[PDB]
Amino acid sequence: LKVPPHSIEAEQSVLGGLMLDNERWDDVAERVVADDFYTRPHRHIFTEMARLQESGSPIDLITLAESLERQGQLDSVGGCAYLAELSKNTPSAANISAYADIVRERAVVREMISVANEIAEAGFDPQGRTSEDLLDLAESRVFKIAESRANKDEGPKNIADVLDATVARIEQLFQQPHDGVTGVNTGYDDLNKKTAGLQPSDLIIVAARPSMGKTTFAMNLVENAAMLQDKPVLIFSLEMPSEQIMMRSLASLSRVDQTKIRTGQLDDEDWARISGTMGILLEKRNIYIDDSSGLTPTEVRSRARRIAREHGGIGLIMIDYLQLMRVPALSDNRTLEIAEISRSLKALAKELNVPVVALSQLNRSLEQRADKRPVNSDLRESGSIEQDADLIMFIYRDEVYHENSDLKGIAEIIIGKQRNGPIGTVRLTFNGQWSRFDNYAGPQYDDE
Amino acid sequence: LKVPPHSIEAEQSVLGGLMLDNERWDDVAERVVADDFYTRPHRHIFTEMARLQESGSPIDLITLAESLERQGQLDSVGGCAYLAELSKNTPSAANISAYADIVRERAVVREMISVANEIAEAGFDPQGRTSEDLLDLAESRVFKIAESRANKDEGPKNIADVLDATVARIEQLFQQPHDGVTGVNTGYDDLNKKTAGLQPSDLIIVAARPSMGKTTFAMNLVENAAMLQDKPVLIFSLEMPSEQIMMRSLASLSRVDQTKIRTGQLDDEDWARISGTMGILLEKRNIYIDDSSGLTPTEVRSRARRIAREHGGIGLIMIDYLQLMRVPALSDNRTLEIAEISRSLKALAKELNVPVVALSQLNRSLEQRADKRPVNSDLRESGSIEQDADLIMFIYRDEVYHENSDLKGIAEIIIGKQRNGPIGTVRLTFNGQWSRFDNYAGPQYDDE
Amino acid sequence: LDLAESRVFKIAESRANKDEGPKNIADVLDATVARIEQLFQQPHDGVTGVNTGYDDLNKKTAGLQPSDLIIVAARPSMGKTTFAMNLVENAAMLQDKPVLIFSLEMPSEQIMMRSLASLSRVDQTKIRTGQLDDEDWARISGTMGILLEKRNIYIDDSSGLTPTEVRSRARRIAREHGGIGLIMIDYLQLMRVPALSDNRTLEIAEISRSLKALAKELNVPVVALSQLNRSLEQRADKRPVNSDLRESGSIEQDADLIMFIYRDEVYHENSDLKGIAEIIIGKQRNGPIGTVRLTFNGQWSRFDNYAGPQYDDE
Amino acid sequence: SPIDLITLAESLERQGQLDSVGGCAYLAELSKNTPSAANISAYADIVRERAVVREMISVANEIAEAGFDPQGRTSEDLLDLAESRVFKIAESRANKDEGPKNIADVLDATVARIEQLFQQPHDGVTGVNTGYDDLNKKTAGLQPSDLIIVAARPSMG
DNA sequence: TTTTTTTTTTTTT
């Protein structure tokens, strides 16, 4: 006698919370309905609660008991004793939303079980229905379950939208071409335009071959975010110690030769710039760095939670880098370890609702191709990283692979994957002297 | 005990008929497999019969009995007496197809029952899995049954039926006058004469050197097709943004300077022409644009299928251009990538029964020859493009190479390939200022 | 050990050589003499294989021999499929056994229209456009009647056909009609082998080997088409040779007959050989190589025997 | 999700693990017996101490068993195994340090270190001199803690 | 279950 899956405790908690806190009815109304309660008395009680709320009466023990007695259904549920027990057994109504979600889970699972039972009954007795008929019946039954998935738009915009956009742009060419920055500012006009800033809850993967300025680009983004927001930002520099990272940051901010900074060959003017940068940084105090080695995802999550709770959230998270993270449980298979790391980081980003720039590295096969511009598959263990990543940005430098290149000092940031925006190339001016990236002010090349 | 549905008599009839006629094995083979039989002895017997058939030996009572005995399976299946009973109980093999289909039906019904039971059990015990995991499991399981029963092959076709279909289609064509243009009207007299319009299922290729107006002629053709049909058209502009494509389309339709539209220098007359074109398009709403780059053939196929299903077919598809599509699986081999892209697009055209005009780029070695008129070998990454293409049109502008050209303002569309027609040249008047191609009304040059 | 080895030798190879294995020269000579006396008993015109329907081609090949692989190659637009369908039609009309066509390249409709244009000697453009007069309709009706009388041609336009599927269908047709007179494949590179999909060359080699094995098994000619490489067009002389095949290596090594289609008119607009197509037999196991001239009526999409002056083969 | 009696109990029941942990009665006992979570850090540290002690005992027992039964392994192999086992436990405790605690101290320390490096008037080479003027200029010598890889085809020197 | 290595055969430039 396999009892249908259910949760007496969850239903009791929801009912008690409704008896205690009426204000959270709406949060419960959207999640669950009367039918979702496995036990019929709970269905009756929720129906009466809905009727009282619709009439505007408050939901409490006395009013609910009176209303149920007036309907003669009070005996069917258990009277003042049972309703008082329902109100009593709830630890707190603050978690009524979670109980409602669990009840919805149970209701959906029971619906799936009933659908399976109906399909099995149809299979046992086709009643002259063809195999095609039974398959279509099963598919129709299952599609009811997948109503909460949808597909949204896949790209095809009709002629009317094209005309509207064309007219708007032709008119705004005379006007000011604003960007529309909503996310965390990237500090660069074109990148902000194509990305609308670093979207919260979205996983961003910056990839490049080593020595391409991957860490440099990430640090520049983090510094720009810190100077353009008050919320703290977080960095996990497993690859390098905090000292080198801070030296890079100071060299970029002060626009001074990082070689001088490292060597200590600093003049009075450069020293004054460094002092000003130090003052600005110690004024902000919105940057946090961890020089830990071999961090596991759980440690990163716990530390991020600590910092967010202490400072009421985090503006940005940075990880340097994915392939350094360790999962001793999945050490046997590297690919599974990487996939689990990526999934955990994505879940962390969603839970904290903060942009997360986690760095990644490419397989050598990229350099075997005639064109060395990276693509999505070039990621090492691209199987899972590409799937989990919401935004993927590749860093390329033609000057690196061609000393006679005409694009000297130019770095290409190619958005190769973007769920909520367009892919494409962007150009930036790379000053290796300061290890910095700047908005590209050169002639615009057509994106062909 | 709800026994799974089965038909033992059908199985025995099939086995006896096979024992009585080897020639009807294939009919049974295409309909059922060994695992389909409800009883394991029948599965073993069918497997042994298949093994005998692969060896070419005649399938009979004694041969089957010996084969099973050599595997120690004789007494397991009931001995020689059971096989003799099976052979005796079957009068004839005439209705063997019906019995095989019955066995297939019972096996698939049992499969459906098993899948439903599995889904129900998983719903009962998620084992910590989220709901969506179970829902996707159910969807995949149902899809497996749906795809398993797939006799998706028309098989060998006698010439009589093909002749009848061809004659019916030819008579249908002869019925409705179309001025010789069977496919969607191109809007150009000589091109229609040489091609009878872009026929259904074709993958048309248009190629040209840079700055030759490669996209311009294709856009003019798409405009002519859309204005001359009720079916929708879809344009994959992997090359240029939708804005520029729409601006070029408006310039061609209204014959307004492209520079003015790009710069916004629109006067009352030009603005009125543009407004009329906008009204015409908003009345039509038969044009769809997708500017996403790096698209796989899979994405193009899915997006074309969406339009076909929503709007009851497609009139034309346009792709700008082939060399921008990406196949991640074969990325490291560009030639394999191009072959896959070309073959997949040809299959898409055939499946949708709609012309697919996809553009391509040429090689520089063309410029080194005495005659700059392009041929098939001049294509870049050429191996598969010609071999898959149906109608290949090369755009040639001597004015670009010779400012002393006697054919200024004239562009030659050379038919480098036409499976169902002759080859030759079509001269057209090219208005670069308006970005349009028009029928050439000047002196006629007889082809050599 | 020597005794045990000898004892096992008395079993394994002793039994293997009887039914199979190395055939002693006596049986081979007996079979050869039987075949020779079979030819002796049957007076023929010299075209032992299925008649190609063309004078010089039949002379140089003596008809399409059983069990042999024939590879008709050309650049696209050179009428490879046209010539192949002409050969299929001639074989069907000159024999009673059925023929089977695998038109992976094109749908059955286009191939059938081409065949009707060739047989009725009617313009392809008119048939495609439906601009047919009464005489053309009468010719097409007569051809339809002839074909519906013959009932000896079968077509399959299924895409992604593997060699195993082709073999199964060929066996099915042979059992249905007691064998096959000819098989036509259009074309090789469109066949699929998922096992060797990683290496294209290995896939092509396996396809070629499987088709040759199929031809040997069914004792029927199998004409499979292929496509060349563009390096051919980079040479001064554009006449195709063996090296010009795409995925070349295995194909020639498996082929018994190789015919390259050349059209000087295609590459030379001022060609003096307009309307003349050169079928170059570049490989022939049991005969001489050389060039043959044919008249190509692209309007009717047909190949006919060249009735013009014969040029000495240098 | 919130960690509470009801949600935890149902989560375990979803994996059939509730009755394995003593059930709802045991969970209620656990919830009741704890007065408050103020001293939770001390309890976690105590649990960590006990777990590490058990780990040390297990490693010692394994080493003793291997010594009793080398199974043909030489002494060096057993000593290296013991070395690795002890080093693993030693490294497993590096969880209190190396974290992104309040940045202000870290920034001050890093800036102070940078100032210290500046004050030391080196001749351009702050690390192990490579002995070559241009290489030292481009690299400032072989820096401490840094991994340097010199590569070339064989026979290149 | 993956990264390497490095044969071999092809295509393409």
Ligand SMILES: Nc1ncnc2c1ncn2[C@@H]1O[C@H](COP(=O)(O)OP(=O)(O)O)[C@@H](O)[C@H]1O
């Ligand atoms: N003094 C300098 N002058 C010019 N370029 C420099 C200087 N210092 C560092 N760089 C550049 O900064 C880049 C940073 O390299 P690295 O951080 O290892 O790359 P990634 O973080 O992308 O793996 C190097 O590729 C180097 O060219």
Ligand SMILES: Nc1ncnc2c1ncn2[C@@H]1O[C@H](COP(=O)(O)OP(=O)(O)O)[C@@H](O)[C@H]1O
């Ligand atoms: N109406 C016509 N007039 C003249 N020639 C034609 C006509 N229709 C087709 N052709 C010729 O028939 C040939 C068939 O091409 P195709 O079958 O693609 O060659 P292949 O099969 O060798 O690749 C074309 O090269 C074309 O020149």
Ligand code: ALF
């Ligand atoms: F070499 Al790096 F981030 F500096 F991959």
Ligand code: ALF
């Ligand atoms: F173009 Al083809 F056979 F018709 F190669």
Ligand code: ALF
């Ligand atoms: F690789 Al060597 F001497 F270091 F041959």
Ligand SMILES: [Mg+2]
């Ligand atoms: Mg770095």
Ligand SMILES: [Mg+2]
């Ligand atoms: Mg062809």
